[PDB]
């Protein structure tokens, strides 16, 4: 409910973070001066020993204990809020348990990440043979993940159309209750990532000759229909159309590695622009993809200190 | 199909969608070539070269005829950097091969 | 090798391990490569060529966006690798061929 009893704390996790100018610093290391300069950090509460496993397994706790605890500390709509920011590795897990249950791997065959509940549900989840009986186990008041898999819970029982299709309901749910709540900017930030993530997939399945009405969703306002049907076929025009929305860097680029580095960085940039709203929920999503961004490129220093790879090759990742 | 430099590499692999594994030493990827011989994986195999670059002993070792299971070199992940010996790499190659030494 | 290794890298230090682990874990094993037959100067080896299904479009909306680039880099390199496989084979038949040769010419020679 209250977004500045837990903002206070955000802003003190905002103030004790690592800045880019340790990862100028890592960026001239073989693994003992940056697993040193790790251990300084945050990360370096959780570095247990040595080696690339050891600080990935550091980064992913201090990540959980970054914003697992955004979890808590919170109770109603900004609990809802709150919620609906860390959907990634929750909705991971979920098409993880479906894949498992409609591919006959073992209950402990998943790696199982930290999700947004408790790992129990998933334990019970994976002795359950009705999905709509996994979803009401799972169902959680404002787990919105559990309300679209009971609404594209009768078309079948474990389907990987039924996932895909349950997968663009999960973005069309978290569409309509970003649209549902008191909060502008975060609806304007969900949007762009939907619309972002809809060019990121048509192009991705470019050229597959497939239905892009079966592809694109519902909810995008920088693109359209007919800009996804343009994208989609081989023409960047669509892509140059892009022209004052914030896909500004984004022109005449067919490529999938450079597009998705700028999308990152107009995400990224979008995101900078949270600290308008203090007594909001915006810092709090700006400080969770600041942070997501810090980890990624401390885990990208740790696997170019192991494989030796070049400044050159990681010089295009330095600029967000 | 099995391939062994590493595992953390052989899931890569397996996010090609074909088997493969990782030892770290000699006689474990032996081993696990000499059941990979025994119980096919379709019989063609890359070791890493800072691991094995001859594995051919498993091949006299289980299956001396047809030579079905082709062993490979490969430049690993960590060595791939440098572009590991190729012209004194078929030096060698024909020092093996032919018994002369060539320029070429 | 070097697309393949540094599209892992990325596709694993920008995302995440478990991720990878279960967007590999997903993707079942794919068995079916196959081979044919060279018969040439009587000699005999098996060479080998790929199926690799790409009907698995385990919901085809790819939940990271690196993973299909890196997977295709990677059935990309098992199509080299196969290449170098029967490079491999055809030089070592045709060198153990000349060396069948050259004892079967020094040894006619010297004694009979």
């Given at each position: 409910d209250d977004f500045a009893y837990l903002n206070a704390r955000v802003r003190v996790r905002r103030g004790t973070l690592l800045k880019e100018s340790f990862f100028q610093e890592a960026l001239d290391l073989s693994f003992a001066d940056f697993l040193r300069l790790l251990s300084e950090t945050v990360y370096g509460g959780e570095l247990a020993g040595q080696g690339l496993p050891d600080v990935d397994r550091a980064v992913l706790r201090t990540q959980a204990k970054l914003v697992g605890d955004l979890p808590?500390?919170?109770?109603?709509?900004?609990?809802?809020?709150?919620?609906?920011?860390?959907?990634?590795?929750?909705?991971?897990?979920?098409?993880?348990?479906?894949?498992?249950?409609?591919?006959?791997?073992?209950?402990?065959?998943?790696?199982?990440?930290?999700?947004?509940?408790?790992?129990?549900?998933?334990?019970?989840?994976?002795?359950?043979?009705?999905?709509?009986?996994?979803?009401?186990?799972?169902?959680?008041?404002?787990?919105?993940?559990?309300?679209?898999?009971?609404?594209?819970?009768?078309?079948?029982?474990?389907?990987?159309?039924?996932?895909?299709?349950?997968?663009?309901?999960?973005?069309?749910?978290?569409?309509?209750?970003?649209?549902?709540?008191?909060?502008?900017?975060?609806?304007?930030?969900?949007?762009?990532?939907?619309?972002?993530?809809?060019?990121?997939?048509?192009?991705?399945?470019?050229?597959?000759?497939?239905?892009?009405?079966?592809?694109?969703?519902?909810?995008?306002?920088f693109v359209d229909r007919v800009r996804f049907a343009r994208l989609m076929e081989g023409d960047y025009a669509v892509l140059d159309e892009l022209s004052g929305t914030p896909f500004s860097g984004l022109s005449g680029v067919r490529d999938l590695k450079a597009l998705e580095r700028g999308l990152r960085c107009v995400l990224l940039k979008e995101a900078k622009k949270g600290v308008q709203d203090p007594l909001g929920v915006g810092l709090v999503l700006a400080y969770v993809k600041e942070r997501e961004w810090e980890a990624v490129r401390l885990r990208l220093l740790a696997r170019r200190a192991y494989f030796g790879l070049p400044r050159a090759q990681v010089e295009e990742e330095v600029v967000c | 199909m099995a391939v062994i430099a590493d595992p953390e590499t052989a899931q890569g692999f397996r996010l090609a969608g074909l088997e493969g594994y990782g030892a770290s030493s000699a006689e474990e990827a032996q081993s696990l070539l000499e059941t990979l011989v025994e119980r096919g994986g379709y019989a063609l195999v890359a070791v890493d070269e800072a691991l094995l670059p001859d594995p051919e002993r498993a091949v006299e070792r289980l299956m001396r005829g047809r030579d079905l299971p082709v062993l490979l070199p490969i430049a690993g992940l960590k060595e791939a950097f440098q572009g590991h010996d190729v012209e004194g790499y078929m030096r060698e190659l024909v020092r093996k091969t032919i018994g002369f030494d060539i320029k070429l | 090798?070097?697309?393949?290794?540094?599209?892992?890298?990325?596709?694993?230090?920008?995302?995440?391990?478990?991720?990878?682990?279960?967007?590999?874990?997903?993707?079942?094993?794919?068995?079916?490569?196959?081979?044919?037959?060279?018969?040439?100067?009587?000699?005999?080896?098996?060479?080998?060529?790929?199926?690799?299904?790409?009907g698995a479009l385990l919901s085809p909306v790819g939940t990271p966006a690196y993973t299909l680039e890196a997977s295709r880099a990677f059935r990309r390199y098992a199509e080299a690798l196969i290449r170098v496989a029967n490079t491999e084979t055809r030089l070592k038949k045709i060198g153990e061929e000349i060396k069948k040769t050259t004892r079967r010419v020094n040894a006619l020679e010297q004694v009979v």
């Open positions: 808590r500390l919170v109770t109603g709509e900004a609990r809802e809020a709150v919620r609906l920011l860390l959907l990634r590795n929750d909705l991971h897990n979920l098409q993880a348990l479906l894949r498992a249950k409609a591919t006959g791997r073992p209950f402990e065959e998943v790696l199982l990440l930290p999700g947004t509940l408790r790992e129990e549900v998933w334990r019970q989840a994976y002795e359950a043979q009705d999905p709509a009986g996994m979803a009401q186990v799972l169902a959680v008041p404002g787990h919105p993940l559990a309300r679209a898999l009971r609404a594209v819970l009768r078309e079948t029982q474990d389907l990987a159309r039924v996932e895909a299709l349950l997968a663009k309901r999960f973005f069309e749910d978290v569409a309509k209750a970003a649209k549902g709540l008191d909060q502008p900017a975060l609806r304007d930030y969900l949007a762009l990532e939907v619309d972002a993530e809809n060019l990121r997939t048509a192009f991705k399945l470019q050229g597959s000759g497939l239905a892009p009405d079966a592809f694109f969703l519902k909810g995008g306002r | - | 090798a070097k697309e393949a290794y540094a599209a892992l890298l990325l596709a694993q230090a920008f995302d995440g391990p478990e991720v990878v682990a279960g967007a590999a874990l997903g993707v079942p094993p794919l068995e079916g490569v196959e081979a044919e037959v060279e018969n040439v100067w009587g000699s005999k080896v098996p060479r080998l060529k790929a199926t690799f299904p790409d």
